Design a protein around this ligand. Structure first.
Ligand code: LD7
Length: 149
């Protein structure tokens, strides 16, 4: 699959992260990201996608070695970590046809896994509106502990 790039934007307290909500197949909450174009550098893709989806330009703040990358079903998604963005920043997507809403969420309150259905003796996982974000949450908490404390 084509690699995706984007960002994990945190506020100044390091408490909260910025998620975006799309439509239809993308109707839940996730980190702003999208597919790399032909010949496009990872940092330029990240900034382009984040600006398209949030109206915030991360180009001046990207750090080359500060990211979390996960391979999910043989597709690579890399989110650059961008701390210290004020909570009163005005975010507006390019594209209300693509982005329903943009909100800060408390990291400590976000799930880092979906819930099973063991009370119902049924296999699988319960739906969760943070499905796309969930894989990055434990790695982000661990990354923050190693960098900041
Ligand atoms: C496949 C199930 C699913 N549900 O929500 C998503 C998802 O990606 N949402 C975040 C997002 C990211 C970028 C974007 F442009 C719009 C929305 N996927």
């Amino acid at each position: 699959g084509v690699p995706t790039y984007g960002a994990i934007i945190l506020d100044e307290t390091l408490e909260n992260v910025l998620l975006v909500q799309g439509y239809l197949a993308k109707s839940g909450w996730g980190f702003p990201k999208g597919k790399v174009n032909k010949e496009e550098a990872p940092h330029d893709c990240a900034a382009r996608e984040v600006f398209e989806e949030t109206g915030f330009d991360i180009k001046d703040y990207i750090c080359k070695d500060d990211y979390i990358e996960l391979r999910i079903n043989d597709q690579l998604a890399r989110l650059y970590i961008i701390p210290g963005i004020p909570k009163d920043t005005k975010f507006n997507p390019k594209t209300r046809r693509e982005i329903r809403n943009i909100e800060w969420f408390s990291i400590e309150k976000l799930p880092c896994h979906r819930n099973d259905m063991t009370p119902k003796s049924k296999l699988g996982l319960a739906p969760n509106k943070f499905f796309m974000a969930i894989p990055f949450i434990r790695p982000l908490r661990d990354w923050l502990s190693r960098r900041f404390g």
